[PDB]
Symmetry: C5
Subunit: 217 residues, 5 copies
């Protein structure tokens, strides 16, 4: 078991060394630039429509927001570090995209630890669970066809020149939706949109989350 004990100690030293090599010894990645655009993949896992407030036209959602991207500055050779193929790290240690809901009515509440997973190909996976209030008229929610609301997500400060967005699919993952929610989901889609606004020449990109729902009976 001495050998086993030693192998454990070595794997610890190797993880600490990989983290030293990527961070502490190398620059904090400054973010994407026009010559060097970054694509961030987004996908939503809708867990619950908690509340629909017809007195203020706000609706509260809980969901997991999957964010994926990939950087060269986060790559490593797993054979240089004892076959370490990935690691968990505090979101504070790396750059993360400023993905923002554009029509929230209260600051998002974070429901999960701010830790991401980094893989040897340099891909990052960060999945914040969130409670969000957003502008939404729930009239029709007490009808067969229910209510329809939409909310757009995207970078706040990086245009389409610097950050692009994609989805893997336009279907929101509903396999974890709360079976006894006050509201049943009729459909939920997530769709990339590209936009040009009157002012600027930068194209603007978002993912539009559209939810159709009604009072469960």
């Amino acid at each position: 078991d001495y050998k086993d004990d030693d192998d454990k100690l070595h794997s610890q030293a190797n993880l600490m060394r990989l983290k030293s090599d990527l961070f502490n010894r190398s620059p904090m990645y400054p973010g994407p630039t026009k010559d060097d655009p970054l694509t961030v993949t987004l996908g939503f896992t809708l867990q619950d429509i908690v509340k629909a407030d017809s007195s203020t036209n706000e609706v509260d959602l809980v969901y997991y927001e999957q964010q994926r991207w990939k950087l060269n500055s986060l790559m490593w050779d797993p054979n240089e570090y004892g076959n370490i193929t990935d690691f968990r790290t505090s979101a504070a240690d790396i750059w993360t995209p400023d993905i923002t809901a554009y029509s929230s009515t209260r600051p998002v509440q974070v429901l999960s630890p701010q830790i991401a997973v980094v893989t040897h190909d340099g891909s990052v996976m960060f999945i914040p669970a969130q409670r969000l209030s957003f502008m939404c008229d729930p009239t029709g929610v007490d009808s067969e066809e229910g209510a329809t609301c939409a909310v757009k997500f995207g970078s706040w400060v990086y245009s389409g020149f610097e950050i692009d967005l994609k989805t893997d699919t336009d279907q929101v993952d509903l396999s974890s939706y709360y079976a006894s929610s006050k509201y049943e989901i009729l459909s939920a889609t997530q769709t990339r949109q590209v936009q040009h606004y009157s002012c600027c020449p930068e194209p603007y990109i978002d993912v539009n989350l559209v939810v159709k729902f009604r009072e469960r009976r």
Copy 2:
């Protein structure tokens, strides 16, 4: 080339942010102008039991510092960059009649351009003093809130708007409240006692329930 671009940005940031480090803010001898513009998104609620109304808007702030200027050719034709608002000086623009601390809805990041201008656009939810009486009539109700520096007079920070028309192109079409008009107007207030003039931007909103 990727590493080169990345290197250029990091070199610029280094030159700017610590070589002659944190900017001490404006003074009478080195004053500054902040341009303000509002993009009104939603009147979320009106409480006539307390005379508070809740607004959601984007507040566009713009200013310019010589200490933020650079030549793009010296840094790989980098014309701009994004940085955390805590890495730079920011103006203390404040609503003068809020009743609750402002809630911030957008990342605290700004865009700096090679000519030394900064654009910082905090999205905000604000509760402020407002009597909604009449909001359910044809005339609607009218409320106003002033914005400006808390600690700097007009001798250190001037305020400006590009237009006195609030941007309503993003106003929530299914809001409980419709906008009849919204203006943003520079005001100057002088006082006999103190020789410094005080500057604000008055946001005036006229609004009504739907019909």
Copy 3:
């Protein structure tokens, strides 16, 4: 030259904050007088099910430290500056009958003058203990709340007001509550807990539902 004003400002602040260790707070040997003045902006809410009332006001704080003074001639004739409240010592002025933590409505920035004078004016929303019984009568209701240091007795911190009249000139004219009177009065208190006198400023507000 604009450059040189900046260098001068940064150097003054480095001399005052770095080229000397901070002010340790007042002592019995070196007591401190703080002047307080209230600018009452709004009575927002009066909850008769809980006997709490919510106020919005500006609280003016003034004091003076020999350790903050300088000769304007050594520093390009800079006579004053703005600085973050965290850079200097600030008095721990506390509402004695609050029922919730004070909510801060203004930026935490103070103004320091070359004579050692500091002016700090936090805007605050406060819930405090108050029976609003009679608020819906001509006579109105009456409430009070004391402000003073939490940890310094009158031997270390003394309080003053410039007047006994709360500044009502910015009071919100469409508030649900009209102010009948508002006074601020220094009091010398003896508490059974402690052999040292404690000083407060007592804010008394008389108000009623509006006509």
Copy 4:
């Protein structure tokens, strides 16, 4: 020998922390088993308008690390100590179906024992998804919530319970809700995407309006 008791404790912590390499968290090579146990104190509220229920409980977490071991003999027979949760690694245990961020009710301090085991017990108020339909009947309502690592799969973190019976010995005897049963059960599952198994502890509560 009390100054010596003190000096020994300081050395131990200095030895373990500000010296020896600290744990970088568990890996597929060096996995960690975390024991969870719940002490249910109160069901505060059941909201049938939103299907949320608020619980107050103590969450017992226990794990063991070689890098936290020591021989009490080298340290004045110190067998355990208390230290801030921020000095050591702690597991990211998370309710999978909360609807608000958890509110912590107890200080963030852990107990570490010479065998390298750590005991951390945060008291929490949790809102989670729960349909309380039937709570006003004899059969009562049943709700469940899963707890597990957010970012570590079963390959890095395994979970266990010491018992499948929730500790009810501190349940508030005058709660609006009576507990009919509460269990805590380890579960394993996979998702068609991934080969790594996922481990949680499922907290199942049956409760009804008290009579």
Copy 5:
């Protein structure tokens, strides 16, 4: 005035000698146990929620303890007998309500008073929601509720508690509160658990109150 400058320099020298010169106190231990004195000053019962059985109290919680590592001879420091310091600069006890339902909200500055004998006084003002059935509050007999306070992580072998009296101080109780106080006591308690070997100490705050008439 040079005298004032000199006192200030002594106070700074003391604080630096006490802290940044002596490695922060690691907390009490089996061999170095500590006694914490607790007293409550009840200011208000703000709210009694009968739909959730939560009651909200506003009170000052007095805490006192003494450490050898904080003592000094005034004669070596310009006869300073005491000073005020941020509560972050020193160890403070982890005194906790055992049946709160919301995190405590702090109403006073986090600053304590240390005196040359090594003793410390820290008095945080707090609003607390805790588990309490206010049934009977609108009657002559009133309602009775209780809430324990004690260390969360130290047992009786490391932290003992004491009260100077078993009567809660009511002299600052708000005279126009919705609720009047029939009685309020604060009593040291020793408990043992089956889970654990060591005995546990708390102070039990019992309050009897009713709707004011």
